[PDB]
Amino acid sequence: VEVCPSLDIRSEVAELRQLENCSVVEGHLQILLMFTATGEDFRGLSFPRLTQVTDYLLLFRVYGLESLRDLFPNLAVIRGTRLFLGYALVIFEMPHLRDVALPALGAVLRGAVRVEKNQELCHLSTIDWGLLQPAPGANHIVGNKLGEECADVCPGVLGAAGEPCAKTTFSGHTDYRCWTSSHCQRVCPCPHGMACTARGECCHTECLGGCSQPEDPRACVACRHLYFQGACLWACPPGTYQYESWRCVTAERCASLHSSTFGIHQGSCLAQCPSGFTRNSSKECKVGTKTIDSIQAAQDLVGCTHVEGSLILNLRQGYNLEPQLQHSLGLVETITGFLKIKHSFALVSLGFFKNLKLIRGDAMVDGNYTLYVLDNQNLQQLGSWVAAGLTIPVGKIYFAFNPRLCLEHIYRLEEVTGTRGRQNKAEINPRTNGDRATRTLRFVSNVTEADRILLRWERYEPLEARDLLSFIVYYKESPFQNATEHSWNLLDVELPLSRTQEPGVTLASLKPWTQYAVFVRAITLTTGAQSPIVYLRTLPAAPTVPQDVISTSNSSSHLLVRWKPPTQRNGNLTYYLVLWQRLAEDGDLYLNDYCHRGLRLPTSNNDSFQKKFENFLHNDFEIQEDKVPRERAVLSGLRHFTEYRIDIHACNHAAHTVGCSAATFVFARTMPHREADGIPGKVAWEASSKNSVLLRWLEPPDPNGLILKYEIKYRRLGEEATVLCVSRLRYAKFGGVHLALLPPGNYSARVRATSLAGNGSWTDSVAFYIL
Amino acid sequence: VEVCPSLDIRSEVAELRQLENCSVVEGHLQILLMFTATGEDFRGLSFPRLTQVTDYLLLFRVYGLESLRDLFPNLAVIRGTRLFLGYALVIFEMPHLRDVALPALGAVLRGAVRVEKNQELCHLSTIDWGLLQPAPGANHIVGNKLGEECADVCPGVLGAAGEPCAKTTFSGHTDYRCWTSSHCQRVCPCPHGMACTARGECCHTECLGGCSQPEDPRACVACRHLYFQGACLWACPPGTYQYESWRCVTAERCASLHSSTFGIHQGSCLAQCPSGFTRNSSKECKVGTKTIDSIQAAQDLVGCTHVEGSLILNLRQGYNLEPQLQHSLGLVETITGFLKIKHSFALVSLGFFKNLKLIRGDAMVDGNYTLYVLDNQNLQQLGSWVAAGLTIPVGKIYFAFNPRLCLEHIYRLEEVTGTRGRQNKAEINPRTNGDRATRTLRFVSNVTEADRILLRWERYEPLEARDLLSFIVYYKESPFQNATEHSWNLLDVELPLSRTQEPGVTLASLKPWTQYAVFVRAITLTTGAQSPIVYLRTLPAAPTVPQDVISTSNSSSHLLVRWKPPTQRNGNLTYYLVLWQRLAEDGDLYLNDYCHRGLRLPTSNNDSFQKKFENFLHNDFEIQEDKVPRERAVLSGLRHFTEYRIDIHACNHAAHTVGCSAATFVFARTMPHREADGIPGKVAWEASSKNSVLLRWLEPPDPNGLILKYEIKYRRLGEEATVLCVSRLRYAKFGGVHLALLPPGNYSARVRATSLAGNGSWTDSVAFYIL
């Protein structure tokens, strides 16, 4: 019946009176921020005419409101075409709201319901959203008043005065459904979505929220699909098209309601044509002040051609956003409002406005400013939308702090704008933008050494050398090629006292194989000319020795060696050269008698006039090698319990250099072999007529290092044993041992060989009798 | 005769004509930057009238000049009252200048001579400065043409046409002195400073540079001390005073020459009165544009009261310069020019202008700007020279980027200036200055825990809580109290759903004993109120275990232990608790027979709906202990070769805490005693009738750990020895050893005791005979 577009009500109860004649609100209905209100203002206030809301219903902080049973006694259907953050019925921070009280509500077509942070709200558990929403699983109803603190008194289970109504299960809690203490939910037996009148009979399917005559689309209270001349229809056949997805309207009527950019494609009279389409009766772009904060917020204007509004670009966290921004922006030909850029750290150029041509400046920044560029920490190019393209009928251009942008670009933009004298300082002020940035000097010779660099640039002609003074060289170690002038190392170069022999400079005390960024600048008498930054790499050299070399022997034939890379690589390390050589035991051990004067056993390895004048003017043994590409190395095929000298070198690309780094040396020893010290075979015994016996045994084949002494243990059967040591010389003198002056009887003898690693293994006992 | 004030000549030879009538230049004479000149322009140019220069003579890059014998043929005396960088005669980078050629020069009263960087200049070695300057040791004459490339041809040694003159030593090189190839230096026999005429006779002392009548001050060519009416005088007795320290002038004449700030104190008509003095016939301050770059450059204006000029303050490297600057500046009452501040990083306040009251703005920055404050990265106070003190008759105030200064101070300054509507945006523009900075929230409770903090601030009254939303808490770990808001840790605090129970917040996952800076801020509906930054320290806790404990035994009774401090101190470490306990050897060693089944010997130790809604709205065994305050510890009074278990704890101020850190344990062993293993006394021997002998020896008193076996070595006199092992049980069974069935003869026996540390010492040989 009525139009009643979307409305928001704030700050006064009188403003609520604009809903007197409304019947179907064609948009969102918001009621919020009503502090100066009591419980009596809403007591005598009612809007029975309202029966439908298209977008959503929002209530937020409406003081003095106790129940909605009077505000919306006939609200039946919420279409939910446009949802507020995915919700169709929002109630937030509402004091004194005792109950929701929507007795006439029929169904929520789309969207969830959010009711939370209500101080004194109860009677919510007796409400089931299954018969209202087609998917009540998205609702969020928490944080209200405690369920135990409010009694769900209604005409049902409790002894109330009203007649009880039926019950319906919601989530397994089959209880009574009661909207309020008096009004309760309406339930009728019929398929879902079939609206029923007060008589319990459900009417024709297109009826929604109520009816008055069974099976009569003309008598419906709210058309489910389409509304047309008081009738409910599936579509709009004859000559009309859908409007706001809830009614049928003629082309002329919808055109009048939309009064040039409206489209009537796909049988819908939309206010704006979609992407890739033009006006058709069978791309202009609108926004008030769009703040582009990131790439994800810049996809609203894809294909936008005539943007009637203002843009505020503020990008601080992005990087390389030129093509992403140029994908959306770039087809814009007219910005009616103002272009404003603040604190755009991410942006580096304004080249995404390729076909920007006109800014009429209907809306402008406060202070008669059309173009407002401020605080762009790194902006250089300023795009290519210049050279007789732009024109500004009204407004002033304000350019500020693009310090990486020279004033030449702003001056060119001002010249091609057609006006120059409109503005003055503090808006295109010097010493304000472009502080961090013209004759350019050219280097003619660059000699790189191991720790020195020699530079020579072009010499000025006598005409241009009149106003020339000593040069200044800035050089600094930059590993990457992303260095620029504002940590720079300073040098002063006095110009040569001749018309030839170009100045040049020598830089010393430089680490080998390093990249240095260097550039020169002339003093040029008055307050001028400088050379582009050049990156030069010094010659490599031999690296340093490896650090902290350690070794271990996990087995009897392996040696794991680990160390650390050198301090300065002096290039790129390609590999390590590892040399090992077997070391033989000293000859002292082969001559000393070790029965006495014993020794420790080695263990296995286990783990200024010029400046002042300028200022005044201005006013057994074998070497084996390996090639280890990684830090750790493993040596295999080594002898058991033998000393090894390990040499390690560090090698960069030193084919032409003096060679690899100086060797670092360590000493390691392999673990002893367990069974290498056993005496081979069995010991033999013989007797002699002169009350004596002889014992013989073969030496171990591969002893650990060497055999120092042989211990022979012998005893008479049944008592203690008396061991005896035999040196190498004593054993080799007779091939064994002698035992003389023994009383008659039987004896058991055992032998054991001791090596440099430790004790051996006792051999089999030999039994010999002497009589 | 003439006045001829200080003059500088540049860019043209015609401008040199302003010296035609000059006789005595009362100031510096500079000739520089003459590129468009040939050798013929100066050929016919001469100034014979000039005979004296007061300050200095500067020549710099005057092309086409070959000799000064024509430019200044009569220049005699250079007073050098004011020196150019300490020099009185500067010749710099002069091409084609073949020779200095100052034949008439008499003396340089004060200052050094600098002649360098001359392409084709020679004839300098034949010049002695002893007769010219009173101290020629400060001269700097290098970098000229090579001495061997120019021949010092003069009428002396070489066969020239001119008559030779006398010679005088300069620095031990007694050679001829010749100014040029024709003119040579004038030398007369008389005391130093006595000017002589062309006849070789030296005149009265006051004469200087020449004379015409012997002993006649009236006929002098240049008065040495004072000049008065053509006469040379020591002082100015009758009615005149010194002017420029070279002449006597009447008070009225000098007043006329100085036309109000001139002073005539101490018999000198100075143009400016000294510090602490006023105008007297028996402090105004002048400068064009003084750039104050540092403290050392700010001492020119000490006591300056009326500064008729402009100041440009630019201080970027200083710190706490408020009192140093207020020592000099502060008495200024009027700045006629403009006040400009750019890039003043060091400055933090403008409080050194205490009595600044007026700025008439005669000189102003380009663009009608009197006060120009720009790019002050940290400025807060803006001084106290406000509240009806200042007044600006003409000019506009430009305030920009004092981001630590709120706009309230600028607005107050504008209001007390008396004018507000003169300026507009882009000069006091918002969002331009004061970005980094009003109701203030107050904390009411702060509970600190070991790793948690609980905060509670005041609750808004219902009148002021209408436009209130969720709070935002910024907290970050700041070891110092120099933290401020722009790395801050963010938290969102939803306001409580009641009129009481103030919001508060809990911060968890915090390191113990750390200082956190926290402050809260209200969202306050529209775009407001925040609390001051508060620093809170969490409660301490027990520290962590020490890391990397190592120990060594440098002697037999010492143990040096070194380790590393724990990772987290959890407070301030006061000391370390070190516990050591003696460990006894295992009982296995006391029972096994070690003649066989030998063992290794141990070694000594050696080394989001809420946010979206807000956005929408906005649009043997004994424990011993020590106390080590330092990292390293030393244990003394320990047994020799005994195992010790060392426990180390870390202790902060843990009197009320659970205690010190968990103990870390290590095992160490002291070095063995050298002579502890020797057998006491001498071994004894006895015989028995049954062809046997017995040997006895006492056990060592304090063996290293324990004695494992005794090795006895015996032999027949003259051949090899046969050693024998005896276990502890075998030795203790009979108190010694038995040797049975020995052939008759003499024998020598020695004993040795082996301990857990190693071999012992052989005792004295015992000789025993068996028959």
UniProtKB/Swiss-Prot annotation, chains A, B:
Coiled coil: none annotated. It comes from Homo sapiens. Residues 620-771 are extracellular. Residues 438-541, 545-607, 679-771 form the Fibronectin type-III domain. Disulfide bonds join 188-196, 190-202, 203-211, 207-220, 223-232, 236-248, 254-269, 595-725. This is Insulin receptor-related protein alpha chain. Glycans are attached at residues 21, 280, 368, 446, 482, 554, 572, 746, 759.
